[PDB]
Each structure stands twice: as structure tokens, then as C-alpha cells.
DNA sequence: TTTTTTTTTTTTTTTTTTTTTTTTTTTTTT
DNA sequence: AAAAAAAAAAAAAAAAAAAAAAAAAAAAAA
């Protein structure tokens, strides 16, 4: 007999009763939700206890994406887009009184209100992350600006009072999944959010760093222009120290996640060049105490006079040391080189810093690559050449003809892989790295560079191609290698006999950054 | 696609069609899984190959299904799944044989 | 004897193509 | 006579499919 009732007091007993049975794939789920919203109408003799259970079942009868039927999602959320005016009069103040009683003291580990606070935050997260609600909200901006208060309080609830591991994780997962701000928050309304990424209550329980670094991903791909304008805060304050302290104070998951954030900024920042030059300023010009908070420096494995001269240790030095232990101690050759890559690109994309590659204080980065290339593993030897794609891109896109001997010096260093592989021409992998590199040089200097004039070509010729071919190529007994190395010449003159596109075509300079790189086609 | 036709071809009877069909339907699957059982395939192909088991009618079709289902269940005892989808690989018997004891 | 990488799959985002609205302007009732 | 309706004819928004990219898991090398 069906008489549990959708409303009144009969449905939720004082701790459970949800409804994941016949309401899974069925519309009648409606009356549990619209029921619960009616129970939230103040009164608060019997209805105060039952506030814990209603926001519990809301996080239970909600579906995932369900590719099998994206319409059961569409139809369940179509109740909320009608009920929404009611959610805003009650669930916002019911969150606020639960928050502010959790923002008045220190001992406040009270299991009634703190177990409710997490359940009401999940309920809002699942409302915001639903993209169909985001397109629908544009129909009424009165509700957008009422709802905007969630962020206005959440931003205080990270850097004030006793924000607990659970309270932080619920607010960060919300801001990772939110999607809402892209169409409803202005760039300046978002800066108060990024302003918290540096300022969080400290408990490096691994849980908390893992979600903190994943938030930076969602914010880079959904808010790039905003993240880059502010990079001088969140990168040196809370991301960059995570790698430097080492694996022991953390877990390898944390270290890898803080390497991925570097690659994402690289795939969204060459778009803007960093004309503010934040990169070289906050990392290679500046020492530790100018940009790293004490919050991470007290946890740092210091060594010698460097501990008393934090005024002199520029961040590039301590980074260069940590990369050295991965190759020589752990054998983590990939982690060392994929990291090393991302910094060199971002640091030197500035159309005057490209020349700093020539400096002896900076050649320690090439030495560090050489110490990887002397290792046994053929895949490691190939990969320590596969990285040079950035060195081509910086030297051949952001270059200025004016510094004639500067250009010539960069173009000479760019042949260093051929000097390393010359004795190793016997090995399959050592032959292949020559081709992969050289495709990227040719492509970037001539196919994707529009600005060739006369003057750029002369630098790219009797100072570049002639020193490549006379001093390396005309000395390899490997005939099948030479066949490919001379095929690139036919392509540039007018015989395009190199498949081009059969079935299974690169033109913008970003294309050389890719894992396959570039081909003859 | 062809396994859909392997079911409904007896709508027009002809035991000459059946007599070659059941013989070829055995040798089709004898080599389909020559490599040592992918974990993912033990759920991917498993899921769509059960989304359409009817007609529940058609007496001369279910003869062919009962003759093939235990040919599969024979290798499911010999060199099945080296762990992973153990549990779902026997749910194949639970709903398929429910049909074969409701309309026979 | 177990670590590391590649094909199958998943997702974003172009690039086409379609959906759709809103300005424009004659002849009769406000 | 003035304001309102009636109809040409340009204009603007957004979802699909496939390439890449990237993940799970599977294929390879210890």
C-alpha cells in the first residue's frame, strides 16, 4: 500500500528514508524534492532535526551523466529549474546560519551542524555543475545575482576561523565542478576566489593537496586570462613549493599533479606571451623570501650557506637541484625532463629572454639533459632529444634579427643533439631523434613562420642549414637516415612527394609542441 | 549485425538454412577470441550482445540459441577471464536461460 | 617474473549548416 | 486625419561529426 506521503512529517524518520527504488528512471522523484523544500518552511520544533536528512537524500536521488539516457538527467533537473525560487529563499539562509555558527569559535567540531554543512554544500555543487541549469539561468539575472552570494561567503570560509579538512574539500570540489562563473561571474568578481588559493588553513593530509591542485586545472581551462594575470600569487605561493620539498613529505601523486598544472598553463599562456615578464621576475631574478611564503619554507630541506643566504638562492637554482636527484638517485627520467621542458618555454617566450639560453649560468640545463642522455635506456635517449621542440619554437618564433651574433649563438646551440648522437649513429633511437628535431626546425622557421622576408631566411641558411648538413649530415654512413634527411629538401622546392594526406596538416607554431611533433606531410 | 540475422532467419523456417547456420555459428566464435581474454571486452561486448535476446515467440529460433549458449559456456570453464569480470561472466546464464525455460 | 607503453575509447571544440528573429513598410481603425 | 496592423528579406545562434588529445587498459619487456 503506497502511503509514505510526499510532504508533512511522515516520510523522513529522524535519521534516514531516501527513495532509490521505483523513483530511479521515473519523474515521481519530484515529490521527494518539492516535499523536502516544503519541510524547510521554518517552524522548527520537529522540523529542525529533519534538516539533516533532507539534504542527505538530495545527494542520493540525483543522477550521474548516464550516457545510456541523458534525458533522465534532463527530466530530473527540469523539476529544480521550476522549484528554484523556493530554494533561494530558504537553502541560502539555512546554509548561512550553519556556516556562521561554524564561523564564531575554535572547538566547533559539533557533529550536528558540521555533518549538515557538508551535505548542503554537495546539494548546491550538483545544482551548479549541471550545464542545462547554467544555459537556463540566463533567462533571469535577478536569480543569478542572488545565487552569487555562495562565492561571497565561501571565499571567507577558507582563510578564516576553523575551516576543517572536510569543509575545505566540499568547497573546492564545488569550485572544480561549478562551471557557472564562465557565463555569470565577471573577471573581477572571480579575483576574490583566486585570492583564496594562496590562503588556506594548513593540514597537508594528502586528500587536501590533491583536490587543491586539481582546482587549478579547471580554473586554467575555464578562466585562462584571469589565472595568467594573477600567476605571481598561486604558482609560487602553493603549487611550486610542492615539488621542491620532495617526495618524502608528500606522495608521488601530489608531485605529478603539480607538474601537470605547468603544462596546462603552457597550453594557455603562449597565447598571451606574458608581456608582464612574471616568469623570469618571480623565479630566476627573485630569491626564496621575495616570493615563497614561510608556510612552506619551514618544511624545506635546506643544505649549507644557502640556509643563511635565502636572499641569493633564486628559485631556478633549487629547482635545478631537485631535477638532478630524479635522474641520478630515483631514475625518474621522464618526470625530470617533462618538468624541465615546461619551465624553459614559459620563462623565455618573452622576445628578449630567448637569448638567455646562451648564458653559462643557464647552460646547466643542457648539462642536466646530457646526464640523462649518457644513460642506457634507448627510450630515455630518444626522449632527451624529443624535448628540444621548445628550444626550436623560442629560437625561431620570438627572435629579433638585430642581435646578429645572439641569433648565430642560439642557432649553434640548437645543433647540440647532433653532437650528442654523432658517436651513437649505430643505435636506432639516436637516428630517429635527429629526424624528429629537424622536422620541427624546418616547419617552425619556414612553414609556420609567416615573417620570412629576406633577412630571416639568410640566418636560417648559411648560419643554420649549411652548418647542419656539412658538419653532421654528409658524415653519416646510415643511408636510410640520409634518404629521409634529403627528402625534406624536395618538399621545400616544389616536389611534394611525401603522402601529404592520403587518409590517416600542421600550419600554426603551437603544432611542434605535440607528442608526435611534425612530419614530412 | 550478422548475429541479429543468426536469430531471426527461421521466421521463414527452412531446416536447410538452419542445418548450415548452427554449424557456421560455432566456427565463427572459435577464433573471435584467439588472444587471452581482454578484461574490458568481458563487459563491453557482453553488454550490447544481451540488449536484444527476443523474439520470445518463434519456436524454431530458440533451438539455435540453446545449441550455441552452452558452446560459449564450455570455453567459459576452460580459458576464461584471468580475474576481473568473473561475476558478470556468469550473469550471462541468469537472464539468457530465464528466456530458454519460459518459451520452450 | 611483474614494469611500462600503445590501441581503443572518450571529450572537447572547430566548421558546417541549420534554426530563427527582427527590422522594414502599406493601408485601415485609434 | 494619425496609429496600428500586415509582410518582405536580411540577419544571428547553436548543435552535430570527426581530428586530435588524452585515458583505461592491454601489450610488451623484464
Amino acid at each position: 500500500e503506497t502511503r509514505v506521503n510526499p510532504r508533512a512529517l511522515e516520510y523522513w524518520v529522524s535519521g534516514e528514508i531516501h527513495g532509490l527504488v521505483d523513483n530511479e528512471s521515473v519523474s515521481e522523484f519530484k515529490e521527494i524534492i518539492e516535499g523536502g523544500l516544503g519541510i524547510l518552511r521554518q517552524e522548527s520544533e520537529d522540523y529542525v532535526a529533519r534538516r539533516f536528512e533532507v539534504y542527505a537524500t538530495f545527494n542520493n536521488i540525483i543522477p550521474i551523466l548516464t550516457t545510456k539516457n541523458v534525458n533522465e538527467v534532463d527530466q530530473k533537473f527540469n523539476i529544480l529549474i521550476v522549484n528554484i525560487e523556493s530554494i533561494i529563499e530558504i537553502c541560502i539562509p539555512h546554509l548561512q546560519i550553519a556556516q556562521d555558527t561554524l564561523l564564531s569559535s575554535s572547538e566547533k567540531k559539533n557533529p550536528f551542524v558540521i555533518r549538515l554543512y557538508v551535505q548542503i554544500v554537495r546539494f548546491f555543487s550538483a545544482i551548479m555543475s549541471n550545464f542545462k541549469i547554467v544555459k537556463w539561468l540566463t533567462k533571469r539575472p535577478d536569480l543569478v545575482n542572488k545565487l552569487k552570494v555562495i562565492y561571497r561567503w565561501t571565499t571567507g570560509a577558507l582563510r578564516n576561523e576553523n575551516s576543517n579538512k572536510i569543509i575545505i574539500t566540499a568547497q573546492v570540489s564545488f569550485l572544480r565542478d561549478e562551471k557557472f562563473g564562465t557565463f555569470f561571474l565577471s573577471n573581477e568578481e572571480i579575483k576574490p576566489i583566486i585570492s583564496t588559493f594562496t590562503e588556506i588553513m594548513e593540514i597537508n593530509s594528502h586528500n587536501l593537496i590533491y583536490e587543491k591542485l586539481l582546482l587549478i586545472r579547471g580554473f586554467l581551462s575555464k578562466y585562462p586570462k584571469l589565472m595568467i594575470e594573477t600567476v605571481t600569487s598561486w604558482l609560487p605561493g602553493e603549487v611550486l613549493p610542492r615539488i621542491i620539498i620532495g617526495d618524502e613529505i608528500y606522495s608521488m601523486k601530489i608531485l605529478i599533479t603539480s607538474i601537470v598544472v605547468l603544462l596546462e598553463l603552457l597550453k594557455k599562456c603562449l597565447d598571451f606571451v606574458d608581456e608582464h615578464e612574471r616568469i623570469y621576475q618571480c623565479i630566476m631574478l627573485s630569491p626564496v623570501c621575495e616570493t615563497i611564503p614561510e608556510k612552506f619554507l619551514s618544511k624545506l630541506p635546506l643544505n649549507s650557506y644557502d640556509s643563511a643566504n635565502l636572499d641569493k638562492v633564486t628559485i631556478g637554482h633549487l629547482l635545478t637541484q631537485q631535477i638532478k636527484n630524479y635522474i641520478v638517485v630515483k631514475n625518474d627520467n621522464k618526470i625530470a625532463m617533462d618538468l624541465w621542458l615546461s619551465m624553459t618555454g614559459l620563462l623565455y617566450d618573452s622576445g628578449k629572454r630567448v637569448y638567455d639560453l646562451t648564458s653559462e649560468s643557464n647552460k646547466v640545463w643542457f648539462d642536466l639533459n646530457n646526464l640523462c642522455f649518457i644513460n642506457n635506456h634507448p627510450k630515455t635517449r630518444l626522449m632527451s632529444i624529443k624535448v628540444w621542440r621548445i628550444i626550436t619554437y623560442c629560437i625561431c618564433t620570438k627572435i629579433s634579427q638585430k642581435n646578429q651574433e645572439g641569433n648565430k649563438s642560439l642557432l649553434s646551440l640548437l645543433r647540440t643533439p647532433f653532437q650528442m648522437t654523432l658517436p651513437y649513429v649505430n643505435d636506432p633511437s639516436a637516428r630517429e631523434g635527429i629526424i624528429y628535431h629537424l622536422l620541427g626546425v624546418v616547419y617552425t622557421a619556414f612553414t609556420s613562420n609567416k615573417n620570412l622576408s629576406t633577412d630571416m631566411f639568410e640566418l636560417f641558411w648559411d648560419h643554420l642549414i649549411t652548418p647542419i648538413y656539412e658538419d653532421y649530415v654528409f658524415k653519416y654512413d646510415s643511408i636510410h637516415l640520409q634518404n629521409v634527411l634529403f627528402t625534406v629538401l624536395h618538399l621545400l622546392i616544389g616536389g611534394k612527394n611525401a603522402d601529404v594526406a592520403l587518409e590517416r596538416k600542421h600550419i600554426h607554431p603551437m603544432s611542434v609542441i605535440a607528442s608526435e611533433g611534425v612530419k614530412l606531410k | 549485425e550478422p548475429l541479429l540475422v543468426f536469430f531471426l532467419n527461421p521466421v521463414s523456417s527452412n531446416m536447410q538454412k538452419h542445418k548450415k547456420s548452427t554449424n557456421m555459428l560455432r566456427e565463427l566464435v572459435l577464433l573471435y577470441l584467439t588472444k587471452p581474454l581482454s578484461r574490458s571486452a568481458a563487459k563491453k561486448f557482453f553488454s550490447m550482445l544481451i540488449s536484444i535476446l527476443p523474439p520470445n515467440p518463434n519456436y524454431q529460433t530458440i533451438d539455435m540459441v540453446n545449441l550455441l549458449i552452452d558452446l560459449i559456456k564450455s570455453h567459459n570453464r576452460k580459458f576464461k577471464d584471468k580475474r576481473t569480470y568473473n561475476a558478470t561472466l556468469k550473469t550471462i546464464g541468469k537472464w539468457i536461460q530465464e528466456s530458454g525455460v519460459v518459451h520452450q
Side-chain angles (χ1 to χ4, degrees):
Chain A
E1 303 175 31
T2 49
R3 221 211 146 61
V4 211
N5 214 287
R7 307 192 156 275
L9 204 88
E10 354 293 274
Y11 193 83
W12 303 278
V13 69
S14 44
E16 287 231 81
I17 302 289
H18 310 299
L20 277 188
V21 203
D22 319 75
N23 286 186
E24 199 29 277
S25 72
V26 177
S27 311
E28 284 33 72
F29 148 102
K30 171 261 166 64
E31 250 317 76
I32 304 167
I33 283 70
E34 209 181 300
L37 295 171
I39 274 73
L40 293 172
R41 289 278 176 196
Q42 300 296 355
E43 293 191 7
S44 297
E45 296 262 42
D46 224 321
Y47 297 69
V48 256
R50 299 176 79 241
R51 276 175 174 83
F52 173 52
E53 298 90 319
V54 60
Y55 298 110
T57 191
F58 292 175
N59 303 313
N60 187 232
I61 345 119
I62 276 173
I64 42 148
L65 174 279
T66 65
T67 3
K68 57 134 185 169
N69 197 273
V70 186
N71 184 58
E72 66 133 298
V73 185
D74 203 351
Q75 194 166 14
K76 284 176 192 163
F77 282 106
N78 260 276
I79 292 143
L80 282 75
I81 66 96
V82 181
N83 292 175
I84 182 63
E85 190 61 272
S86 77
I87 302 173
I88 289 172
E89 62 157 301
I90 41 153
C91 302
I92 286 169
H94 296 331
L95 183 147
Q96 198 209 326
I97 63 96
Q99 177 193 265
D100 299 357
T101 57
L102 291 178
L103 272 90
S104 294
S105 70
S106 173
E107 74 313 313
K108 60 165 68 287
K109 308 190 184 189
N110 183 322
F112 292 115
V113 67
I114 207 157
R115 199 181 186 190
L116 172 51
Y117 183 78
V118 60
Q119 258 62 279
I120 189 165
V121 171
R122 289 185 230 271
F123 169 61
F124 287 119
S125 182
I127 291 164
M128 306 293 277
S129 56
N130 185 284
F131 214 122
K132 294 187 164 68
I133 295 183
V134 190
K135 257 228 194 217
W136 180 264
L137 263 167
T138 316
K139 288 169 149 75
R140 244 171 63 193
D142 52 345
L143 272 62
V144 176
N145 218 52
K146 291 159 81 191
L147 180 69
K148 204 171 289 193
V149 82
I150 295 167
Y151 305 87
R152 295 256 298 285
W153 295 324
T154 296
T155 49
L158 297 168
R159 73 214 293 179
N160 206 344
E161 281 256 324
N162 283 45
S163 187
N164 195 272
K165 181 186 171 177
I166 184 168
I167 290 166
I168 306 161
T169 308
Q171 289 166 167
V172 177
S173 52
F174 158 45
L175 293 172
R176 177 174 54 65
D177 296 327
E178 60 90 43
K179 291 171 164 67
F180 162 87
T182 60
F183 299 141
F184 293 123
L185 295 173
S186 91
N187 292 25
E188 304 312 303
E189 291 180 316
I190 296 163
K191 290 183 192 167
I193 305 165
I194 285 164
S195 165
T196 70
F197 293 1
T198 50
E199 289 199 329
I200 57 102
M201 294 298 162
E202 182 40 47
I203 170 45
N204 280 335
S205 197
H206 298 59
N207 194 266
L208 195 68
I209 315 97
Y210 190 66
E211 188 108 57
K212 267 175 51 65
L213 298 172
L214 289 172
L215 182 69
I216 315 305
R217 293 194 62 187
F219 267 67
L220 273 164
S221 229
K222 295 298 181 186
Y223 308 113
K225 176 68 190 77
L226 304 78
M227 288 294 282
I228 297 153
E229 192 173 301
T230 60
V231 68
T232 52
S233 64
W234 52 262
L235 174 62
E238 266 274 345
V239 177
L240 192 62
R242 305 302 187 157
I243 316 96
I244 297 160
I245 290 168
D247 49 311
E248 191 59 275
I249 315 305
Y250 289 124
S251 165
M252 300 291 275
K253 273 194 167 202
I254 310 306
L255 282 63
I256 298 156
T257 308
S258 50
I259 290 163
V260 175
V261 175
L262 319 172
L263 303 172
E264 291 211 318
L265 180 69
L266 179 63
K267 280 194 175 188
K268 298 289 183 181
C269 191
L270 304 192
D271 338 15
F272 302 97
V273 177
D274 188 18
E275 30 147 49
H276 311 180
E277 208 175 66
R278 306 315 195 165
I279 10 75
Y280 204 104
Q281 190 223 334
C282 293
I283 304 168
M284 195 162 286
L285 191 156
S286 301
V288 189
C289 37
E290 182 110 317
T291 67
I292 273 58
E294 222 302 284
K295 185 183 174 184
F296 292 102
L297 180 52
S298 83
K299 284 291 194 177
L300 187 57
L302 309 174
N303 199 119
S304 305
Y305 103 92
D306 35 285
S307 181
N309 273 118
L310 300 161
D311 66 342
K312 166 57 218 141
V313 182
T314 51
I315 318 304
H317 169 283
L318 52 81
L319 290 167
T320 299
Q321 211 82 257
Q322 223 269 320
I323 306 158
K324 209 177 190 174
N325 16 289
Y326 286 130
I327 297 156
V328 187
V329 185
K330 316 285 190 175
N331 198 62
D332 309 344
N333 287 270
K334 188 177 191 297
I335 279 70
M337 291 288 96
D338 292 346
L339 184 167
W340 172 97
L341 238 172
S342 205
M343 343 301 280
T344 310
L346 292 166
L347 275 166
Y348 302 166
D349 195 63
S350 342
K352 73 190 208 274
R353 295 296 175 176
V354 183
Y355 298 93
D356 306 14
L357 289 168
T358 63
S359 189
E360 234 71 20
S361 49
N362 305 48
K363 287 178 183 159
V364 298
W365 292 62
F366 305 135
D367 297 330
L368 172 60
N369 256 246
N370 197 308
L371 299 176
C372 180
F373 181 85
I374 61 169
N375 213 312
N376 311 277
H377 211 30
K379 47 220 283 277
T380 297
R381 276 184 285 131
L382 187 84
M383 172 281 293
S384 67
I385 305 171
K386 191 172 177 167
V387 296
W388 283 68
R389 61 169 84 103
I390 188 59
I391 312 296
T392 19
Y393 166 93
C394 296
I395 292 170
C396 301
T397 66
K398 315 304 173 81
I399 198 71
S400 116
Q401 182 282 325
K402 294 172 283 286
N403 187 0
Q404 198 88 298
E405 292 300 295
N407 313 326
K408 176 197 250 288
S409 298
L410 295 169
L411 297 182
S412 212
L413 288 168
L414 192 59
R415 299 189 295 267
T416 294
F418 307 161
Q419 194 60 43
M420 295 165 160
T421 50
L422 176 62
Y424 292 2
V425 68
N426 303 286
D427 187 303
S429 67
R431 293 178 246 131
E432 220 55 37
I434 296 163
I435 300 168
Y436 182 100
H437 177 284
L438 185 61
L439 281 159
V441 191
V442 170
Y443 168 69
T444 313
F446 306 127
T447 304
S448 77
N449 176 30
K450 309 301 96 168
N451 302 324
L452 190 64
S453 188
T454 301
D455 43 284
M456 302 266 144
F457 184 78
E458 292 264 50
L459 307 183
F460 303 143
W461 205 265
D462 277 348
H463 302 288
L464 185 65
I465 306 324
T466 299
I468 288 164
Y469 280 77
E470 278 207 294
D471 232 352
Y472 300 94
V473 183
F474 304 155
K475 300 170 187 172
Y476 300 135
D477 285 334
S478 185
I479 187 62
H480 79 293
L481 170 69
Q482 279 202 340
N483 205 355
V484 190
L485 297 177
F486 303 149
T487 294
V488 194
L489 312 175
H490 194 209
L491 277 157
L492 286 175
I493 63 176
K496 187 130 62 57
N497 181 35
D499 318 334
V500 334
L502 285 164
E503 269 241 343
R504 295 288 199 162
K505 301 145 198 159
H506 297 300
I507 48 162
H508 187 64
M510 79 188 266
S511 316
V512 80
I513 283 62
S515 191
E516 240 287 72
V518 191
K519 299 300 155 177
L520 328 100
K521 53 79 50 49
Chain B
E1 8 288 342
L3 282 178
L4 212 149
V5 191
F6 274 118
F7 202 115
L8 92 170
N9 86 80
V11 163
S12 303
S13 313
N14 277 287
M15 275 279 150
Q16 242 287 112
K17 281 166 33 153
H18 186 297
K19 178 191 304 166
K20 27 151 177 155
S21 189
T22 309
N23 270 305
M24 296 285 274
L25 183 48
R26 181 183 79 236
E27 301 296 313
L28 179 77
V29 196
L30 176 62
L31 301 165
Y32 166 62
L33 244 79
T34 297
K35 261 173 67 176
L37 289 273
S38 37
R39 321 158 179 142
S40 188
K43 194 220 192 171
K44 284 182 177 170
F45 300 124
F46 155 95
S47 191
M48 281 289 212
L49 286 169
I50 65 170
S51 189
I52 21 168
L53 175 62
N56 268 45
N58 296 203
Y59 303 108
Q60 254 57 34
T61 66
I62 297 298
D63 171 294
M64 202 174 310
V65 325
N66 281 320
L67 254 75
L68 76 87
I69 284 286
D70 250 64
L71 295 170
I72 295 161
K73 249 176 280 154
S74 87
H75 279 300
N76 282 185
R77 266 86 165 189
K78 285 167 59 190
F79 204 130
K80 76 167 229 286
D81 11 301
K82 192 189 74 183
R83 285 175 171 166
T84 318
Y85 289 109
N86 274 326
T88 18
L89 248 289
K90 272 50 176 174
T91 64
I92 78 95
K94 168 172 165 165
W95 43 62
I96 221 293
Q97 197 123 12
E98 139 149 69
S99 90
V101 193
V102 165
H103 56 214
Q104 182 80 85

